[PDB]
Amino acid sequence: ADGNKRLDAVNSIVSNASCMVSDAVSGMICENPGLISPGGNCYTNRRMAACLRDGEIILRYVSYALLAGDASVLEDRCLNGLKETYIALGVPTNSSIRAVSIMKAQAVAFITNTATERKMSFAAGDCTSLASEVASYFDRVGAAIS
Amino acid sequence: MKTPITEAIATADNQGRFLSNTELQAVNGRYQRATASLTAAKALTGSAQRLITGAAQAVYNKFPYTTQMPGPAYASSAIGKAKCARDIGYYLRMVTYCLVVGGTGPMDEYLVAGLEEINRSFDLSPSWYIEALQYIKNSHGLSGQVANEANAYIDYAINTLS
Amino acid sequence: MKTPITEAIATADNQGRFLSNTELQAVNGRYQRATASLTAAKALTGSAQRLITGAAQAVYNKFPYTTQMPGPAYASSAIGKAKCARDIGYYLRMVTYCLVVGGTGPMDEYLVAGLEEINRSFDLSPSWYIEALQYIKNSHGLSGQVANEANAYIDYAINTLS
Amino acid sequence: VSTTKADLRYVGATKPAAVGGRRAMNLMKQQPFWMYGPPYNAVTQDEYEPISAAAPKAFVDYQIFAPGTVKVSPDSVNANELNPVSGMSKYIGKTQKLVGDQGISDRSDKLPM
Amino acid sequence: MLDAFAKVVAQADARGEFLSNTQIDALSKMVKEGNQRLDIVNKVTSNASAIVTNSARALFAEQPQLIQPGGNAYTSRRMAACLRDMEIVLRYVSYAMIAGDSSVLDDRCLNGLRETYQALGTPGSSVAVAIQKMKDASVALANDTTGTPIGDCSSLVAELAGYFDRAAVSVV
Amino acid sequence: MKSVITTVVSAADAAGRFPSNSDLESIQGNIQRSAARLEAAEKLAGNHEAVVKEAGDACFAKYAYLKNPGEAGENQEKINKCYRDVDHYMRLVNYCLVVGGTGPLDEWGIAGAREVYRTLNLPTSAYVASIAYTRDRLCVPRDMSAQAGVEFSAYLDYLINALS
Amino acid sequence: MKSVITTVVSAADAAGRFPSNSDLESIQGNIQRSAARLEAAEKLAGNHEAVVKEAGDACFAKYAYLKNPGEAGENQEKINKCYRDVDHYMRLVNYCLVVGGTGPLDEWGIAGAREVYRTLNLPTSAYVASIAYTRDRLCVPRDMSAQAGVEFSAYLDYLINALS
Amino acid sequence: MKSVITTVVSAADAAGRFPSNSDLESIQGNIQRSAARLEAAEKLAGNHEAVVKEAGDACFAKYAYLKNPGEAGENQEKINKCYRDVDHYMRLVNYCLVVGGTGPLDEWGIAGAREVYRTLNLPTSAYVASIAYTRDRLCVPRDMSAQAGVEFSAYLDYLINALS
Ligand SMILES: *CC[C@H]1/C(=C/c2[nH]c(/C=C3N=C(/C=C4\NC(=O)C(CC)=C4C)C(C)=C\3CCC(=O)O)c(CCC(=O)O)c2C)NC(=O)[C@@H]1C
Ligand SMILES: *[C@@H](C)[C@H]1/C(=C/C2=NC(=C\c3[nH]c(C[C@H]4NC(=O)C(C=C)=C4C)c(C)c3CCC(=O)O)/C(CCC(=O)O)=C2C)NC(=O)[C@@H]1C
Ligand SMILES: *[C@@H](C)[C@H]1/C(=C/C2=NC(=C\c3[nH]c(C[C@H]4NC(=O)C(C=C)=C4C)c(C)c3CCC(=O)O)/C(CCC(=O)O)=C2C)NC(=O)[C@@H]1C
Ligand SMILES: *[C@@H](C)[C@H]1/C(=C/C2=NC(=C\c3[nH]c(C[C@H]4NC(=O)C(C=C)=C4C)c(C)c3CCC(=O)O)/C(CCC(=O)O)=C2C)NC(=O)[C@@H]1C
Ligand SMILES: *[C@H](C)[C@H]1/C(=C/C2=NC(=C\c3[nH]c(C[C@H]4NC(=O)C(C=C)=C4C)c(C)c3CCC(=O)O)/C(CCC(=O)O)=C2C)NC(=O)[C@@H]1C
Ligand SMILES: *[C@H](C)[C@H]1/C(=C/C2=NC(=C\c3[nH]c(C[C@H]4NC(=O)C(C=C)=C4C)c(C)c3CCC(=O)O)/C(CCC(=O)O)=C2C)NC(=O)[C@@H]1C
Ligand SMILES: *[C@H](C)[C@H]1/C(=C/C2=NC(=C\c3[nH]c(C[C@H]4NC(=O)C(C=C)=C4C)c(C)c3CCC(=O)O)/C(CCC(=O)O)=C2C)NC(=O)[C@@H]1C
Ligand SMILES: *[C@H](C)[C@H]1/C(=C/C2=NC(=C\c3[nH]c(C[C@H]4NC(=O)C(C=C)=C4C)c(C)c3CCC(=O)O)/C(CCC(=O)O)=C2C)NC(=O)[C@@H]1C
Numbered sequence A: 001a002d003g004n005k006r007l008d009a010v011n012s013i014v015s016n017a018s019c020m021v022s023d024a025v026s027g028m029i030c031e032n033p034g035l036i037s038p039g040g041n042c043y044t045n046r047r048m049a050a051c052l053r054d055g056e057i058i059l060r061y062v063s064y065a066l067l068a069g070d071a072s073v074l075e076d077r078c079l080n081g082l083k084e085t086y087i088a089l090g091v092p093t094n095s096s097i098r099a100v101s102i103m104k105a106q107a108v109a110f111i112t113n114t115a116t117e118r119k120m121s122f123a124a125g126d127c128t129s130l131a132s133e134v135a136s137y138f139d140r141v142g143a144a145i146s
Numbered sequence B, C: 001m002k003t004p005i006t007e008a009i010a011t012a013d014n015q016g017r018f019l020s021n022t023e024l025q026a027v028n029g030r031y032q033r034a035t036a037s038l039t040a041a042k043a044l045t046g047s048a049q050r051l052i053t054g055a056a057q058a059v060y061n062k063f064p065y066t067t068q069m070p071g072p073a074y075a076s077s078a079i080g081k082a083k084c085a086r087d088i089g090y091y092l093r094m095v096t097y098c099l100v101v102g103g104t105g106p107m108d109e110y111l112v113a114g115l116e117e118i119n120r121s122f123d124l125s126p127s128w129y130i131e132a133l134q135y136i137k138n139s140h141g142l143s144g145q146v147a148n149e150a151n152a153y154i155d156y157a158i159n160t161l162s
Numbered sequence D: 001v002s003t004t005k006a007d008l009r010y011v012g013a014t015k016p017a018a019v020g021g022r023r024a025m026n027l028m029k030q031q032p033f034w035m036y037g038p039p040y041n042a043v044t045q046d047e048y049e050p051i052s053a054a055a056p057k058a059f060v061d062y063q064i065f066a067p068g069t070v071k072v073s074p075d076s077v078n079a080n081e082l083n084p085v086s087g088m089s090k091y092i093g094k095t096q097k098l099v100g101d102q103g104i105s106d107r108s109d110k111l112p113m
Numbered sequence E: 001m002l003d004a005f006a007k008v009v010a011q012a013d014a015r016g017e018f019l020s021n022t023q024i025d026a027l028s029k030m031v032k033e034g035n036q037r038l039d040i041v042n043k044v045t046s047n048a049s050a051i052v053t054n055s056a057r058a059l060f061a062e063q064p065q066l067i068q069p070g071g072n073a074y075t076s077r078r079m080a081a082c083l084r085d086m087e088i089v090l091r092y093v094s095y096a097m098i099a100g101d102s103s104v105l106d107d108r109c110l111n112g113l114r115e116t117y118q119a120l121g122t123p124g125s126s127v128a129v130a131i132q133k134m135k136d137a138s139v140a141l142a143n144d145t146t147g148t149p150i151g152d153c154s155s156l157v158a159e160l161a162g163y164f165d166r167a168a169v170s171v172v
Numbered sequence F, G, H: 001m002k003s004v005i006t007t008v009v010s011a012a013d014a015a016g017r018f019p020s021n022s023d024l025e026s027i028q029g030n031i032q033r034s035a036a037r038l039e040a041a042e043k044l045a046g047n048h049e050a051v052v053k054e055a056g057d058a059c060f061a062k063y064a065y066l067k068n069p070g071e072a073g074e075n076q077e078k079i080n081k082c083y084r085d086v087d088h089y090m091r092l093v094n095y096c097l098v099v100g101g102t103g104p105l106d107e108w109g110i111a112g113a114r115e116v117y118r119t120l121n122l123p124t125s126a127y128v129a130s131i132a133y134t135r136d137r138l139c140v141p142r143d144m145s146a147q148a149g150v151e152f153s154a155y156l157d158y159l160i161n162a163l164s
């Protein structure tokens, strides 16, 4: 087979993982800047620290599902209970899809190597099947919440 | 075997006396309760493979490392998945045996005695089976006193695993 | 307490006799072995904070569900992460007691008597503790008979959990 | 002479902890304020949750945003309201866990996961 | 031991009397509850492991000195004996609930328990907190429906609460 | 105002009657229940600036569209008139626990409000997003009594009912 | 406990007699006085964390020398035990308004206190300055009623005269 | 609806009689026989999406001419109304096993059915090819019990006989 393309694409995501999550959850604040006004729910220090923790778990799931090559890692208890966990806590659950849709845009940038401020060295060839394979996983997560 | 009839013969043979209405009233309580206990045994038997397949899938969603981790103790192969569904069928079958005889007798002899020596040896977590028994408790579809008879022996199996 | 010194006295007291050379040779074997046992106890005490916090991370890397799953049994909170490292330090402290004393007597009394009932009650898995004890066996850096003395009490704790 | 709010909380602590989840610690109660400090060291119910162990490597940069869209409010602007002559302060230090609330929480809102 | 039916018989044999017509009508009400009593004993026994363990979990959250070195529940033999006692008290409280009389409860569990904990040094004010935490886990489990027909059981949950208070004052 | 006294004195006057024994028996009920409502009329009148000012933040954290241009939260004078309104309603709820009925909430807070809020384009779903914040956040042994926390939270969702 | 009931029972037990007509006349005083002293015991039991912490730093506002080395307010544990020991004393005053006498203050707070505060070197004029601050903080119509404040202050300076 | 309790009341009212011991003795048969037709009514209440599917194409497998132009099942809008009709008959058989007699199937699904299928050119041989397939796709120890596969099969060919 070709497990080298599989390993190149996972490594390009687990390398830029913390830059991805902090770009995603701050592009989410940038669009509605009332999440960090008083009363908003990324305002306090612990609510900020948990919104950052959520995107790291979500990206870990999509990174580990890409390494195995199946969505059997996606369902977990993560796929079920996220939509009910955010409604019960009281979390803007459509604005939580903006952060996953942003993270989806970055991962297909690093895989297709069209990232507009980072360039990595690969072989030559194609990766636009793996880019679609991770667009589906970022769609399975953002459809489990709505 | 702990049934309500053998535990009444044993309390009269211990002092060497004939059966009285202390013991006849105990066997009478088995007969009045066996109406609801034998409809739950028909229902769990007919719904067996719906409940064994569904409960194995609920352990793999609560503990998804069990399908990922390599090793003989995990359901991450074809052989290890075949032994996991075999284990849910053993637990469901002892529940239907307990509903027939009216006590917690068959799963004492066939399931409980020697259980923790096996889970220690073969590295099986006893919380894998509590989630499986909680699926069967919530999805057998029984109601009334038919459910209370089935749940009372399912909840007995959870108490020995914890 | 089961030491080589107090197994000899208890042997002579159960027979009602003085300490013959059968018991003076058993005490002499402890004194010949106490050189390697007491330098292993010094070297594991000086490496305590390195070995405890390193072996808690070895469990979180092999069983990474133990940091995500909610509930009181897991190292998912501030108090569960504090109680996991407290238990590696209990295991490391009893190994140093056994090396000083010379037998598996402190951890038989303080640690393994009643440990199976505690793990089943509080839902702690004994395969977690085996992985942390395999890290301490592969990271103390001892050599020769000093490593032979330390390893013989680390996998005595492994055989009681497995 | 029990109440409905008290019996709906304690009935989640009868499930096993492999089933009940965060509801296994629902039998603990609110203690006095001095009980949470240095000789006694009683644990709150928030510390059994995964929100007490949140420490991500990612961070918000706060210079991405436009000027005017970052808000900061204090708790008081008074020096002996923030820290008295004694060390008993709600705001500064290790003595902010000495309070008559916040020993218990709401983990019956969501689920038994 | 003797249950609630045998309790009034023993009070009547010592007077040498037949039972009254009023006394038979008061024992018909004890049979008329009958099934509601067996629902409380079913709910308490079926969740017996989780009531003991989760109320030991909540005791060590509020009194964390019991599991520090030098505390009374610090070792494996001393912790396993603590959970064993909390299961012993819940056993004989369910025995006293099916019988309607607290006679097996004190003649086989409670008499000599205060003398035992005073010779060992076990803190008796912490045992009664563990008893009072199994109480409200069980009187909240008593008055929830969960597959029982709807009705008023508030007279039988005051009797179950009174057996937990009896076990708590015989050790404090 | 609709109180306990004003109902039974109006109705006897509507019939041309004197006060009779059924009138005095209802004002007797204004002696048992009066101790609890005068305990939530006092916890609200001593801590109103702290309940108003972080219930109005729930009105804006849930409806972030209101801070767009053209809405009712565009400049800062409009936002200040919003917090004044939540303080206006809590002063009426405090008036209700002293009168005993829903007299002042009906005449001064409801009777006209559906016209005014529709002309000036203020959504009522943002008004009930903040009154429901106060109701779902009462802590019944800590904030007040048990029966004072029933009658406080009964006048709240009377106002939630009348506006939505 | 020293109470009204336990005084008249012990007096008629040492004499070996039944409850007389003068022993029932004393429990009638326990009825007509219970209205005032249960209002003070309920006002205190609801707002006790704010009354204790307001008086705990009235000790250190008068005696700032307690943070010096070797003193009783050095570290965090010693001020946790200090705010505890004040909260112990305010719980016993709540117990004395409920019972009706100086019973719980005598057996649990005062007996043995001189030998402990001298052995452990806790300045007994600072276990007083917190009690004396609460007695003058009380506004007689604002927090409680007139006779509820008479009962509240009379148990507050019993403790002052027992530490002095 | 025609059942046991309707027919023994309509007959005992044609004569003007009180309910007699032959009217009660019929309804005792409603008690012994309901325990077999209710676990064949819930057995179809769960699995009914798979039986309208497995039998709705059994006709179209048999009568493959139905999808030619001009015919009944020529296009998917008409095929969806066709699968809906086998759902309609399976719902009434679930209704019939609850009541005990064929009142639902008669009054709703049978009465007038010949007037319409002749008008709208529906071949009733296709309607009975579905219902006969469900009858013999039935494993009487596996699908349900033995005497439940009597009650399920009894109403299944009563519908066949009323369409044939
Ligand atoms: C969480 C419980 C508290 C606690 C308990 C504790 N108990 C013991 C030891 C014993 N308890 C008994 C009492 C009984 N034994 C019985 O079989 C019966 C049934 C009739 C009763 C009522 C006895 C005999 C012992 C001693 C024997 C033993 O079990 O080891 C201990 C151990 C004390 C020790 O020194 O080993 C504990 C810790 N202690 C606490 O801290 C909790 C508050
Ligand atoms: C960290 C900087 C990574 C990185 C991540 C990438 N982000 C990419 C696109 C992107 N950028 C934003 C910017 C956002 N952050 C803000 O603070 C604000 C304003 C307040 C905004 C708008 C967003 C929302 C997105 C998602 C797509 C979009 O909506 O524009 C991206 C793709 C860019 C490319 O094609 O190269 C990447 C790779 N970029 C890096 O290189 C480091 C490693
Ligand atoms: C208790 C069982 C709850 C709980 C209570 C907390 N509330 C906290 C702060 C806070 N509380 C209120 C409402 C309160 N003030 C009032 O005047 C009235 C009655 C009219 C009530 C009910 C407000 C408005 C605020 C904001 C700040 C303030 O004024 O105090 C609080 C402190 C931390 C926090 O805000 O969470 C607690 C602990 N919280 C709980 O978790 C349980 C469920
Ligand atoms: C703050 C007002 C003081 C101060 C006080 C300290 N008091 C300390 C200990 C202490 N207090 C008591 C009496 C208290 N315990 C009770 O059980 C009851 C009644 C139910 C009462 C009133 C006792 C018996 C003790 C000693 C036992 C203990 O450690 O709690 C104390 C601790 C002494 C120490 O740390 O050695 C302090 C610091 N400290 C101050 O600066 C001002 C004088
Ligand atoms: C951030 C982009 C969001 C946001 C997130 C918040 N989440 C909060 C708590 C929380 N989050 C989760 C889900 C997380 N845990 C998991 O196990 C998994 C997947 C396996 C995920 C995604 C849970 C279960 C919880 C509750 C547990 C806990 O509280 O520790 C949270 C705190 C809310 C609060 O307690 O007040 C926040 C702020 N919030 C946002 O605004 C954006 C949209
Ligand atoms: C897709 C994101 C990239 C891309 C991928 C390709 N990689 C190819 C070969 C290749 N890649 C690696 C690195 C990878 N394999 C590993 O074993 C490990 C880690 C242990 C990693 C990160 C290796 C080692 C190789 C083999 C050649 C070499 O030695 O570098 C490749 C050619 C096909 C093949 O032979 O596998 C492709 C297409 N290339 C791209 O154009 C996009 C951007
Ligand atoms: C009270 C704490 C409960 C509650 C109890 C009720 N149970 C009622 C009837 C009932 N209970 C059982 C089960 C019981 N009988 C047994 O023989 C055995 C096991 C051997 C058990 C566990 C049965 C079989 C029955 C049927 C008898 C009957 O229906 O009379 C009941 C009567 C209903 C009524 O009269 O309203 C009550 C009140 N119900 C509750 O809501 C609380 C939670
Ligand atoms: C904030 C949570 C609201 C919001 C409120 C606005 N209200 C505006 C005007 C306004 N409000 C009232 C009702 C108020 N007056 C009373 O006398 C009483 C009860 C005694 C109440 C509740 C009136 C009568 C008026 C009009 C006169 C005035 O300016 O006060 C207002 C300005 C309207 C405008 O000019 O656009 C705002 C913005 N806005 C929000 O976004 C949420 C829904």
Ligand SMILES: *[C@H](C)[C@H]1/C(=C/C2=NC(=C\c3[nH]c(C[C@H]4NC(=O)C(C=C)=C4C)c(C)c3CCC(=O)O)/C(CCC(=O)O)=C2C)NC(=O)[C@@H]1C
Pocket: G043, G044, G045, G047, G050, G051, G054, G134, G137, G138, G139, G140, G142, G143
């Ligand atoms: C009466 C002399 C004055 C007056 C004094 C003020 N007291 C103020 C606040 C306050 N007072 C107390 C003590 C009192 N309230 C209680 O609940 C209890 C015991 C249970 C007592 C002895 C407390 C605890 C507080 C703080 C809580 C509060 O009321 O806000 C006060 C406000 C300023 C301050 O913070 O001290 C004043 C002005 N008030 C009057 O109107 C008359 C003239």
Ligand SMILES: *[C@H](C)[C@H]1/C(=C/c2[nH]c(/C=C3N=C(/C=C4\NC(=O)C(CC)=C4C)C(C)=C\3CCC(=O)O)c(CCC(=O)O)c2C)NC(=O)[C@@H]1C
Pocket: B059, B066, B067, B072, B073, B074, B075, B076, B079, B080, B081, B083, B084, B085, B087, B088, B090, B110, B111, B118, B122, B124, B128, B129, B132
């Ligand atoms: C499935 C829920 C989970 C799982 C199962 C699993 N089990 C085993 C091995 C054994 N299970 C038993 C249990 C019983 N045997 C009995 O006879 C009875 C009573 C009727 C019981 C309860 C035993 C004895 C074994 C070991 C011997 C054997 O394999 O037959 C395995 C294989 C482990 C191994 O081979 O070492 C597996 C995979 N494991 C999971 O991951 C599921 C979550």
Ligand SMILES: *[C@H](C)[C@H]1/C(=C/c2[nH]c(/C=C3N=C(/C=C4\NC(=O)C(CC)=C4C)C(C)=C\3CCC(=O)O)c(CCC(=O)O)c2C)NC(=O)[C@@H]1C
Pocket: C056, C059, C066, C072, C073, C074, C075, C076, C079, C080, C081, C083, C084, C085, C087, C088, C090, C110, C111, C118, C122, C124, C128, C132, E057, E060, E067, E073, E074, E075, E076, E079
């Ligand atoms: C850490 C590697 C893993 C883990 C640990 C964890 N353990 C507990 C709780 C207990 N551990 C013990 C063990 C001992 N106590 C002793 O005194 C001795 C001998 C000196 C031993 C070996 C006991 C008795 C408990 C229960 C007491 C208590 O409640 O603290 C917990 C808490 C479980 C709970 O229900 O409270 C945790 C989290 N768990 C993990 O996830 C790590 C993988």
Ligand SMILES: C=CC1=C(C)[C@@H](Cc2[nH]c(/C=C3N=C(/C=C4\NC(=O)[C@H](C)[C@H]4CC)C(C)=C\3CCC(=O)O)c(CCC(=O)O)c2C)NC1=O
Pocket: H059, H066, H072, H073, H078, H079, H081, H082, H083, H084, H085, H086, H088, H089, H108, H109, H116, H120, H122, H123, H124, H126, H127
């Ligand atoms: C409660 C019981 C109940 C029913 C069973 C149905 C019976 C029924 N079916 C149809 C209507 C129809 N029925 C079919 C049926 C079929 N097409 C085929 O190829 C096969 C012959 C057959 C099933 C496989 C078709 C194609 C139509 C639409 C025909 C038309 O509208 O011209 C109509 C006319 C009104 C309508 O279109 O809905 C009615 C009353 N309605 C009911 O209320």
Ligand SMILES: C=CC1=C(C)[C@@H](Cc2[nH]c(/C=C3N=C(/C=C4\NC(=O)[C@H](C)[C@H]4CC)C(C)=C\3CCC(=O)O)c(CCC(=O)O)c2C)NC1=O
Pocket: H043, H044, H047, H048, H050, H051, H054, H137, H138, H139, H140, H142, H143, H144, H152
């Ligand atoms: C109303 C009652 C009722 C039923 C009977 C079943 C009917 C039924 N059985 C099967 C499905 C099946 N049924 C059988 C049973 C048998 N095959 C044989 O050769 C023997 C005659 C018989 C065993 C005695 C088998 C072997 C399958 C699987 C084969 C298949 O799905 O095509 C299916 C397809 C979906 C499924 O598998 O569930 C359905 C709807 N469902 C119901 O709701």
